[PDB]
A paper describes a structure:
In order to reveal the atomic-level details of co-translational folding, we determined the structures of a series of nascent model peptide with increasing amino acid length. For this study, we chose the human Pin1 Trp-Trp domain (WW domain), which consists of 35 residues, as our model peptide. The topology of the WW domain composed of three strands and two beta-hairpins, which form an antiparallel beta-sheet. The structures of the intermediate-length (WW11-MBP, WW17-MBP, WW19-MBP) and full-length (WW35-MBP) WW domains, which are fused with MBP at their C-termini, were determined with X-ray crystallography.
In this study, we prepared WWX, where the X-residue N-terminal WW domain fragments is denoted using the format WWX. WW11, WW17, and WW19 take an alpha-helical conformation. The structures of WW17 and WW19 form helices in the same manner as WW11, in which the region of the residues 12–15 forms helical structure. The most prominent difference between WW17 and WW19 is the torsion angles between residues Ser16 and Arg17, however, they share essentially the same helical structure. Though WW17 harbors residues 17–20, which form hairpin loop 1 in WW35, their conformations are not identical to WW35. In WW35, the loop arises through an interaction between the backbone amide N of Ser16 and the carbonyl O of Arg21. However, in WW17, this hydrogen bond is not formed. On the other hand, the residues 17–20 at the C-termini of WW17 and WW19, where hairpin loop 1 is formed in WW35, take more extended conformations, while the conformations are stabilized by a kind of the short-range interactions. In the presence of 30% 2,2,2-trifluoroethanol (TFE), which simulates the physiological conditions, WW17 and WW19 contain about 25% helices and do not contain beta-strands. In addition, the crystal structures of WW17 and WW19 revealed that the region of loop 1 is different from that of the wild type.
Residue numbers in the entry: 1 to 387
Write the structure that this text describes.
């Protein structure tokens, strides 16, 4: 084995009552999914399940559910099913919070092999794969018929649009997920992937490539092309109201842009130092709470209602999922240019590790970016800390 991620002391404080029966309600399904996803669409699938079974399906979307789940599940409470990108699930699994899932070989053949890989932890399947998420460059086609192919061009493009009372680019600077594609472009990485194994001793958050990418970000801010305060909501409002020509976001965001006046394109992220931006790619996945008394219901719901063409379509019509893991539905989606873009950024990026250390990693990088962007620390100082 390998050294446990930080916080064993705290996980042990949650020990009492863990398995000593604390109740999730038997005879229904409670599901957690992030509020940016198609949770209404998911609830519709839930209604279909209820019609066929008499089993009520309740979908909730609490803020910070990826942090709340291990807190509530460790005591044996929480949702029956938790949706999040696969990167959090190895930590959950190592804490004992997830049931191993048991799809037969027939079912497994309906999803792409690499998506099962993403939800396999220490040789065992610990969640159902749903969709493949990659960030793309989203741009206003009226403001910008030809989107920039490089990060390097964006300051000049900004000067251009500033003269027209617009700006070039706004995206969420508070979550490192969104700046990671730039940090990784010139060689930053999380953990060294050697011989099919992640080396937790070899972290690349402060190598030359990481520093170059983060420095480019902070220079954008220094030069008033971006603002360190910009978050998800600010950037989205600004793009969807036509004040900024570009944003960086995932497929879930398209629905809101659709309802806007903006005629937009979805495309490949620009290069940095001549190399592709490398988004960390997530597989939206559904795990079954180890403490759930409804595991067979959860299985049935996920395999026979959600992971179907009609199930994923209900969710997708609410908020687009991206490239889905279900082969039959993905062949249909693959024709959308926006999904093509999603797929290109996905293959240029890297499927996130699911190892238990990912939570600590993201927290470290989150702090590093925020501190460097605000000017509280220098790029070198901030990244040195993260290592
Ligand atoms: O920023 C750190 C954060 O990145 C990823 O979270 C994504 C998630 O994958 C997407 O589904 C979407 O909801 O946006 C999130 C970023 O705000 C990781 O999956 C997550 O563990 C990590 O903390």
């Amino acid at each position: 084995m390998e050294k446990l991620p930080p916080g064993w002391e705290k996980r042990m404080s949650r020990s009492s009552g863990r398995g000593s029966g604390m109740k999730i309600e038997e005879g229904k399904l409670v599901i957690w999914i992030n509020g940016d996803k198609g949770y209404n669409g998911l609830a519709e699938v839930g209604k279909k399940f209820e019609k066929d079974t008499g089993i009520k399906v309740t979908v909730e979307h609490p803020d910070k559910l990826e942090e709340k789940f291990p807190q509530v599940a460790a005591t044996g409470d929480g949702p029956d099913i938790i949706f999040w990108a696969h990167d959090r699930f190895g930590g959950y699994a190592q804490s004992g919070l997830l049931a191993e899932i048991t799809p037969d070989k027939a079912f497994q053949d309906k999803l792409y092999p690499f998506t099962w890989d993403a939800v396999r932890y220490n040789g065992k399947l610990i969640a159902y794969p749903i969709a493949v998420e990659a960030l793309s460059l989203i741009y206003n086609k009226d403001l910008l018929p030809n989107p920039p192919k490089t990060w390097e061009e964006i300051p000049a493009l900004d000067k251009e649009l500033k003269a027209k009372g617009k700006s070039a680019l706004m995206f969420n600077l508070q979550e490192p997920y969104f700046t990671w594609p730039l940090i990784a472009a010139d060689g930053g990485y999380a953990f060294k992937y050697e011989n099919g194994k992640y080396d937790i001793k070899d972290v690349g958050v402060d190598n030359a490539g990481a520093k170059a990418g983060l420095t480019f970000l902070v220079d954008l801010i220094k030069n008033k092309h971006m603002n360190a305060d910009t978050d998800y909501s600010i950037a989205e409002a600004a793009f969807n109201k036509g004040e900024t020509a570009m944003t960086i976001n995932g497929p879930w965001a398209w629905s809101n842009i659709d309802t806007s006046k903006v005629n937009y394109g979805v495309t490949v992220l620009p290069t940095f130092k001549g190399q592709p931006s490398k988004p960390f790619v997530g597989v939206l996945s559904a795990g079954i709470n180890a403490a759930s008394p409804n595991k067979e219901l959860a299985k049935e719901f996920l395999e026979n209602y959600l992971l179907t063409d009609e199930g994923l379509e209900a969710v997708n019509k609410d908020k687009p999922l991206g490239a889905v893991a279900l082969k039959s539905y993905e062949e249909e989606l693959a024709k959308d240019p926006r999904i093509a873009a999603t797929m290109e950024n996905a293959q240029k990026g890297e499927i996130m590790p699911n190892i238990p250390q990912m939570s600590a990693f993201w927290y470290a990088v989150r702090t590093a970016v925020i501190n460097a962007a605000s000017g509280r620390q220098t790029v070198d100082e901030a990244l040195k800390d993260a290592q």
